[PDB]
Amino acid sequence: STSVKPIFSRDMNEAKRRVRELYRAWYREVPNTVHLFQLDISVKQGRDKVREMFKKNAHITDPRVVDLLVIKGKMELEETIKVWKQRTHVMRFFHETEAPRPKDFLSKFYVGHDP
């Protein structure tokens, strides 16, 4: 039952190799992206954001899911490197317009009914 067709990785050790390789490519590419897209952020800010995205999923332990996340990341790399994206797409990771939303009970209580 648990026997399942793999995507690329046969174990988490082989998958975590692809995660690290992907982080390398992203880390090289932020300096060019800031220059090419003419963004008003720093290279450190972009490299921090890459770290944040890689940290969000820091809990997964399924080799197949990690492969898909790596596949999706690599696609976003082809888009950004080849300038298929635009300045609006690259800057959507930073959520500049979204004013900070309350994250404490009292603040949520004063504004609305949401959990």
């Binding site: 995507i7 898909l68 596949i71 696609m75 976003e76 082809e78 888009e79 298929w84 994206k85 635009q86 797409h89 959507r92």
Partner: peptide, 17 residues
């Protein structure tokens, strides 16, 4: 759905990102 050994698998109809 992922199709293995595809020449270039990428979004075609949805927006970038």
């Amino acid at each position: 759905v992922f199709f293995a050994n595809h020449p270039d698998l990428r979004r075609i109809l949805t927006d970038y990102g």
